[PDB]
Short mmCIF file of N, CA and C and ligand atoms in Angstrom, two decimals:
data_model
loop_
_atom_site.label_atom_id
_atom_site.label_comp_id
_atom_site.label_asym_id
_atom_site.label_seq_id
_atom_site.Cartn_x
_atom_site.Cartn_y
_atom_site.Cartn_z
N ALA A 278 159.57 98.77 143.02
CA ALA A 278 159.16 100.02 142.34
C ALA A 278 158.73 101.16 143.28
N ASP A 279 157.96 100.86 144.33
CA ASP A 279 157.65 101.88 145.35
C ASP A 279 158.93 102.47 145.92
N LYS A 280 159.96 101.65 146.06
CA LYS A 280 161.18 102.13 146.67
C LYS A 280 161.96 103.06 145.72
N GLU A 281 161.49 103.21 144.47
CA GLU A 281 162.06 104.15 143.50
C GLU A 281 161.45 105.57 143.64
N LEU A 282 160.50 105.74 144.56
CA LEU A 282 159.88 107.06 144.78
C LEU A 282 160.97 108.10 145.03
N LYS A 283 160.89 109.23 144.31
CA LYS A 283 161.99 110.20 144.34
C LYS A 283 161.70 111.33 145.33
N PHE A 284 162.56 111.47 146.33
CA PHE A 284 162.41 112.45 147.39
C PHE A 284 163.32 113.63 147.14
N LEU A 285 162.85 114.79 147.56
CA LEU A 285 163.68 115.97 147.62
C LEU A 285 163.69 116.40 149.11
N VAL A 286 164.89 116.45 149.68
CA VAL A 286 165.09 116.84 151.06
C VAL A 286 165.74 118.24 151.14
N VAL A 287 165.00 119.19 151.72
CA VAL A 287 165.32 120.61 151.69
C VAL A 287 165.58 121.14 153.10
N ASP A 288 166.77 121.67 153.33
CA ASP A 288 167.11 122.30 154.62
C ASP A 288 168.40 123.04 154.41
N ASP A 289 168.51 124.24 154.98
CA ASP A 289 169.78 124.98 154.92
C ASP A 289 170.85 124.48 155.86
N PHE A 290 170.48 123.55 156.75
CA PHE A 290 171.40 122.91 157.69
C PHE A 290 171.68 121.55 157.08
N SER A 291 172.88 121.33 156.60
CA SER A 291 173.17 120.09 155.91
C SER A 291 173.10 118.86 156.81
N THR A 292 173.39 119.02 158.10
CA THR A 292 173.24 117.94 159.06
C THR A 292 171.82 117.36 159.08
N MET A 293 170.80 118.20 158.97
CA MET A 293 169.49 117.65 158.94
C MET A 293 169.20 116.86 157.62
N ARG A 294 169.72 117.36 156.50
CA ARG A 294 169.51 116.63 155.26
C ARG A 294 170.13 115.23 155.34
N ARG A 295 171.31 115.15 155.96
CA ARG A 295 171.94 113.82 156.20
C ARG A 295 171.07 112.90 157.02
N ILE A 296 170.56 113.39 158.14
CA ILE A 296 169.73 112.57 159.00
C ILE A 296 168.47 112.04 158.30
N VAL A 297 167.80 112.92 157.55
CA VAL A 297 166.59 112.54 156.88
C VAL A 297 166.90 111.57 155.75
N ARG A 298 167.92 111.87 154.94
CA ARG A 298 168.28 110.98 153.83
C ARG A 298 168.69 109.60 154.34
N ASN A 299 169.40 109.57 155.45
CA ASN A 299 169.79 108.29 156.03
C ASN A 299 168.63 107.48 156.59
N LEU A 300 167.66 108.14 157.21
CA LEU A 300 166.46 107.41 157.58
C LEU A 300 165.78 106.84 156.34
N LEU A 301 165.65 107.66 155.29
CA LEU A 301 165.05 107.14 154.09
C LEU A 301 165.80 105.90 153.60
N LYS A 302 167.12 105.93 153.64
CA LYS A 302 167.92 104.79 153.18
C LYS A 302 167.58 103.54 154.02
N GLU A 303 167.41 103.74 155.31
CA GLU A 303 167.04 102.60 156.16
C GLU A 303 165.66 102.04 155.87
N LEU A 304 164.76 102.88 155.36
CA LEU A 304 163.44 102.45 154.94
C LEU A 304 163.46 101.92 153.51
N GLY A 305 164.62 101.90 152.87
CA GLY A 305 164.75 101.37 151.54
C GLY A 305 164.58 102.33 150.39
N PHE A 306 164.54 103.62 150.70
CA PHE A 306 164.45 104.68 149.68
C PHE A 306 165.79 105.35 149.41
N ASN A 307 166.38 105.05 148.24
CA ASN A 307 167.69 105.60 147.88
C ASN A 307 167.66 106.67 146.81
N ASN A 308 166.47 106.91 146.27
CA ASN A 308 166.31 107.88 145.20
C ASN A 308 166.00 109.23 145.82
N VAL A 309 167.05 109.88 146.31
CA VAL A 309 166.93 111.04 147.18
C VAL A 309 167.87 112.14 146.72
N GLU A 310 167.36 113.35 146.53
CA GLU A 310 168.21 114.50 146.21
C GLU A 310 168.02 115.55 147.31
N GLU A 311 168.93 116.51 147.33
CA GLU A 311 168.94 117.53 148.36
C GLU A 311 168.93 118.93 147.79
N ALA A 312 168.39 119.85 148.58
CA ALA A 312 168.47 121.26 148.29
C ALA A 312 168.68 122.09 149.55
N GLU A 313 169.36 123.23 149.42
CA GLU A 313 169.70 124.02 150.61
C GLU A 313 168.76 125.19 150.89
N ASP A 314 167.87 125.51 149.97
CA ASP A 314 166.85 126.54 150.15
C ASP A 314 165.71 126.35 149.19
N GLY A 315 164.65 127.15 149.30
CA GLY A 315 163.49 126.94 148.47
C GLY A 315 163.71 127.22 146.99
N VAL A 316 164.62 128.12 146.67
CA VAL A 316 164.90 128.46 145.27
C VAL A 316 165.55 127.25 144.59
N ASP A 317 166.56 126.72 145.24
CA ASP A 317 167.22 125.53 144.71
C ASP A 317 166.24 124.36 144.66
N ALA A 318 165.37 124.20 145.66
CA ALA A 318 164.40 123.14 145.63
C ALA A 318 163.43 123.26 144.47
N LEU A 319 162.88 124.45 144.28
CA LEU A 319 161.94 124.69 143.19
C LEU A 319 162.55 124.45 141.84
N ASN A 320 163.82 124.82 141.67
CA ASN A 320 164.51 124.52 140.43
C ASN A 320 164.60 123.02 140.18
N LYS A 321 164.93 122.23 141.21
CA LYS A 321 164.96 120.80 141.03
C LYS A 321 163.57 120.23 140.72
N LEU A 322 162.54 120.69 141.42
CA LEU A 322 161.18 120.21 141.22
C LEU A 322 160.67 120.49 139.82
N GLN A 323 160.96 121.68 139.31
CA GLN A 323 160.43 122.09 138.02
C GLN A 323 161.03 121.20 136.93
N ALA A 324 162.15 120.57 137.23
CA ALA A 324 162.79 119.63 136.29
C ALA A 324 162.08 118.26 136.17
N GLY A 325 161.20 117.94 137.10
CA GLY A 325 160.36 116.77 137.00
C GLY A 325 160.83 115.56 137.80
N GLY A 326 159.90 114.64 137.99
CA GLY A 326 160.22 113.32 138.44
C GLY A 326 160.09 113.10 139.94
N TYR A 327 159.88 114.17 140.70
CA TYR A 327 159.76 114.03 142.15
C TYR A 327 158.37 113.54 142.60
N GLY A 328 158.40 112.80 143.69
CA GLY A 328 157.19 112.25 144.29
C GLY A 328 157.00 112.56 145.76
N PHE A 329 157.94 113.24 146.40
CA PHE A 329 157.79 113.54 147.82
C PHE A 329 158.80 114.62 148.20
N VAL A 330 158.35 115.64 148.94
CA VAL A 330 159.23 116.68 149.45
C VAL A 330 159.23 116.67 150.97
N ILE A 331 160.42 116.78 151.55
CA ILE A 331 160.59 116.95 153.01
C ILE A 331 161.33 118.27 153.19
N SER A 332 160.75 119.25 153.89
CA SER A 332 161.32 120.59 153.89
C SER A 332 161.30 121.27 155.23
N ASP A 333 162.41 121.91 155.50
CA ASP A 333 162.59 122.88 156.57
C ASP A 333 161.74 124.13 156.32
N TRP A 334 161.62 124.99 157.31
CA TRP A 334 160.91 126.23 157.11
C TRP A 334 161.90 127.36 156.91
N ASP A 335 162.62 127.79 157.94
CA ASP A 335 163.48 128.98 157.78
C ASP A 335 164.74 128.68 156.96
N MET A 336 164.78 129.32 155.80
CA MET A 336 165.88 129.18 154.85
C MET A 336 166.00 130.49 154.09
N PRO A 337 167.21 130.83 153.63
CA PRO A 337 167.35 132.07 152.85
C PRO A 337 166.78 131.94 151.45
N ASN A 338 166.53 133.11 150.86
CA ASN A 338 166.09 133.29 149.47
C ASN A 338 164.62 132.90 149.20
N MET A 339 164.23 131.69 149.61
CA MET A 339 162.84 131.25 149.66
C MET A 339 162.70 130.28 150.81
N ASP A 340 161.78 130.56 151.72
CA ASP A 340 161.59 129.70 152.88
C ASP A 340 160.59 128.59 152.58
N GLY A 341 160.41 127.67 153.53
CA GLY A 341 159.64 126.46 153.27
C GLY A 341 158.16 126.69 153.15
N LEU A 342 157.65 127.73 153.81
CA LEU A 342 156.23 128.08 153.67
C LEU A 342 155.99 128.61 152.26
N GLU A 343 156.89 129.47 151.79
CA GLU A 343 156.82 129.99 150.41
C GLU A 343 156.93 128.83 149.42
N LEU A 344 157.83 127.89 149.68
CA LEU A 344 158.00 126.73 148.80
C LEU A 344 156.73 125.91 148.75
N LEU A 345 156.19 125.59 149.93
CA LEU A 345 154.94 124.85 150.04
C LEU A 345 153.81 125.51 149.28
N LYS A 346 153.63 126.82 149.47
CA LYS A 346 152.58 127.54 148.79
C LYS A 346 152.79 127.52 147.31
N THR A 347 154.03 127.62 146.86
CA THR A 347 154.31 127.60 145.42
C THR A 347 153.94 126.24 144.83
N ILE A 348 154.34 125.17 145.52
CA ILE A 348 154.04 123.84 145.05
C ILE A 348 152.51 123.63 144.95
N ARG A 349 151.80 123.99 146.01
CA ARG A 349 150.37 123.77 146.06
C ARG A 349 149.62 124.56 144.98
N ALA A 350 150.19 125.69 144.57
CA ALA A 350 149.57 126.57 143.58
C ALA A 350 149.97 126.25 142.14
N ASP A 351 150.88 125.30 141.97
CA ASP A 351 151.39 124.89 140.64
C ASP A 351 150.70 123.63 140.19
N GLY A 352 149.86 123.74 139.16
CA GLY A 352 149.08 122.60 138.73
C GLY A 352 149.88 121.39 138.31
N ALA A 353 151.13 121.58 137.94
CA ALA A 353 152.00 120.48 137.57
C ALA A 353 152.40 119.60 138.77
N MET A 354 152.30 120.14 139.98
CA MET A 354 152.74 119.42 141.16
C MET A 354 151.91 119.72 142.39
N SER A 355 150.67 120.13 142.20
CA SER A 355 149.87 120.64 143.30
C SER A 355 149.54 119.61 144.37
N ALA A 356 149.58 118.31 144.05
CA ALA A 356 149.30 117.29 145.06
C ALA A 356 150.55 116.62 145.60
N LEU A 357 151.74 117.12 145.28
CA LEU A 357 152.98 116.53 145.75
C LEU A 357 153.02 116.55 147.28
N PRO A 358 153.33 115.42 147.92
CA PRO A 358 153.43 115.44 149.37
C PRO A 358 154.52 116.38 149.82
N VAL A 359 154.24 117.15 150.87
CA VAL A 359 155.21 118.06 151.45
C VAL A 359 155.16 117.90 152.96
N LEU A 360 156.19 117.29 153.51
CA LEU A 360 156.33 117.09 154.96
C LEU A 360 157.20 118.19 155.53
N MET A 361 156.65 119.05 156.40
CA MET A 361 157.42 120.09 157.07
C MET A 361 158.20 119.51 158.22
N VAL A 362 159.49 119.79 158.26
CA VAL A 362 160.37 119.34 159.33
C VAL A 362 161.18 120.55 159.75
N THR A 363 160.78 121.14 160.88
CA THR A 363 161.21 122.47 161.25
C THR A 363 161.38 122.63 162.75
N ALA A 364 162.31 123.45 163.19
CA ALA A 364 162.42 123.83 164.60
C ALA A 364 161.25 124.70 165.08
N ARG A 365 160.46 125.27 164.15
CA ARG A 365 159.36 126.15 164.53
C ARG A 365 158.23 125.32 165.12
N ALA A 366 157.94 125.56 166.39
CA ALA A 366 157.09 124.65 167.17
C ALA A 366 155.80 125.27 167.68
N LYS A 367 155.52 126.54 167.35
CA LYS A 367 154.32 127.18 167.91
C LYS A 367 153.08 126.68 167.24
N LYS A 368 151.97 126.63 167.98
CA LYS A 368 150.73 126.21 167.35
C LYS A 368 150.40 127.03 166.15
N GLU A 369 150.61 128.33 166.19
CA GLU A 369 150.27 129.15 165.04
C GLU A 369 151.14 128.82 163.81
N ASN A 370 152.38 128.36 164.04
CA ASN A 370 153.25 127.92 162.94
C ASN A 370 152.66 126.67 162.30
N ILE A 371 152.20 125.75 163.13
CA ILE A 371 151.63 124.51 162.64
C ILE A 371 150.37 124.80 161.84
N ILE A 372 149.53 125.69 162.39
CA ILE A 372 148.29 126.06 161.74
C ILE A 372 148.58 126.73 160.39
N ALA A 373 149.56 127.62 160.33
CA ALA A 373 149.85 128.29 159.08
C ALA A 373 150.31 127.30 158.01
N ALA A 374 151.20 126.38 158.41
CA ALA A 374 151.70 125.39 157.45
C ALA A 374 150.57 124.46 157.03
N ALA A 375 149.76 124.02 157.98
CA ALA A 375 148.61 123.18 157.65
C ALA A 375 147.65 123.86 156.67
N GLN A 376 147.28 125.09 156.97
CA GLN A 376 146.36 125.83 156.13
C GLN A 376 146.93 126.03 154.74
N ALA A 377 148.25 126.14 154.66
CA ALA A 377 148.92 126.28 153.36
C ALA A 377 149.03 124.93 152.61
N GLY A 378 148.60 123.82 153.20
CA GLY A 378 148.61 122.52 152.49
C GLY A 378 149.65 121.51 152.92
N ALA A 379 150.34 121.73 154.03
CA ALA A 379 151.33 120.75 154.49
C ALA A 379 150.71 119.35 154.66
N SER A 380 151.46 118.35 154.27
CA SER A 380 151.01 116.97 154.37
C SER A 380 151.23 116.38 155.75
N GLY A 381 152.10 117.00 156.53
CA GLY A 381 152.45 116.58 157.87
C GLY A 381 153.40 117.60 158.45
N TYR A 382 153.75 117.44 159.71
CA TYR A 382 154.60 118.40 160.42
C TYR A 382 155.36 117.69 161.52
N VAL A 383 156.68 117.85 161.47
CA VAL A 383 157.61 117.25 162.46
C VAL A 383 158.42 118.40 163.06
N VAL A 384 158.55 118.47 164.37
CA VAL A 384 159.37 119.49 165.04
C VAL A 384 160.78 118.99 165.30
N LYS A 385 161.78 119.83 165.01
CA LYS A 385 163.17 119.56 165.35
C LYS A 385 163.49 120.12 166.73
N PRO A 386 164.32 119.41 167.50
CA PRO A 386 164.94 118.12 167.16
C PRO A 386 163.95 116.98 167.24
N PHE A 387 164.16 115.98 166.39
CA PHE A 387 163.24 114.84 166.32
C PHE A 387 164.01 113.56 166.47
N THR A 388 163.29 112.52 166.85
CA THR A 388 163.78 111.15 166.67
C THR A 388 163.44 110.59 165.30
N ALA A 389 164.25 109.67 164.83
CA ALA A 389 163.94 108.97 163.62
C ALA A 389 162.60 108.28 163.74
N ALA A 390 162.28 107.76 164.93
CA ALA A 390 160.97 107.15 165.13
C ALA A 390 159.79 108.07 164.79
N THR A 391 159.82 109.31 165.27
CA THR A 391 158.80 110.29 164.94
C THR A 391 158.77 110.54 163.46
N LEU A 392 159.94 110.73 162.84
CA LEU A 392 159.95 111.03 161.44
C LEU A 392 159.36 109.88 160.66
N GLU A 393 159.72 108.64 160.98
CA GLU A 393 159.15 107.46 160.30
C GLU A 393 157.64 107.39 160.47
N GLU A 394 157.16 107.69 161.67
CA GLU A 394 155.73 107.62 161.92
C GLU A 394 154.99 108.59 161.00
N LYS A 395 155.53 109.80 160.83
CA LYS A 395 154.87 110.81 160.04
C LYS A 395 154.95 110.45 158.57
N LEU A 396 156.08 109.91 158.13
CA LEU A 396 156.20 109.49 156.75
C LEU A 396 155.18 108.39 156.48
N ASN A 397 155.06 107.41 157.37
CA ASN A 397 154.13 106.29 157.17
C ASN A 397 152.70 106.77 157.08
N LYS A 398 152.35 107.76 157.90
CA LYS A 398 151.00 108.31 157.87
C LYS A 398 150.67 108.85 156.48
N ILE A 399 151.63 109.52 155.86
CA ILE A 399 151.45 110.05 154.52
C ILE A 399 151.46 108.92 153.46
N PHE A 400 152.40 107.98 153.54
CA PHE A 400 152.51 106.78 152.65
C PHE A 400 151.17 106.07 152.65
N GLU A 401 150.57 105.93 153.83
CA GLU A 401 149.31 105.23 153.95
C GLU A 401 148.29 105.86 153.01
N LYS A 402 148.26 107.18 152.97
CA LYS A 402 147.43 107.90 152.00
C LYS A 402 147.91 107.82 150.54
N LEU A 403 149.20 107.56 150.31
CA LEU A 403 149.70 107.31 148.94
C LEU A 403 149.43 105.86 148.50
N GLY A 404 148.78 105.08 149.36
CA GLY A 404 148.45 103.71 149.02
C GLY A 404 149.65 102.79 149.07
N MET A 405 150.73 103.24 149.71
CA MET A 405 151.91 102.42 149.81
C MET A 405 151.78 101.51 151.03
F1 BEF B 625 165.03 126.30 159.92
BE1 BEF B 625 163.99 125.33 160.16
F2 BEF B 625 162.68 125.83 160.05
F3 BEF B 625 164.20 124.46 161.31
MN1 MN B 626 166.65 126.34 158.46
#
């Protein structure tokens, strides 16, 4: 049943969505959907059933910081985990995402090992 947790993987670079979804599959999570920007992601989220978001930052139409802030401000999903996975590596970028409620932060390019470590840190708090 834990492995039924529903992920939304958001990035305008489809190669990154593949990498993240495939790591999830190796960890036993197959209930995974994708979105290419924050608008498409928010539309999927508002439809219900999600339990974890993994999101890029720079994307057209709505970026990942805007998405994160929207999620955190929406009482229907305000505690949804949101893992930032972004090429933006400056301390001030990390601080901004953190202050906005990010559950974790991974810099691209990444190893699957790093990504797993960050996911586990959050799972640990989900009691998984
Ligand atoms: F475009 Be992302 F923030 F790497
Ligand atoms: Mn991007």
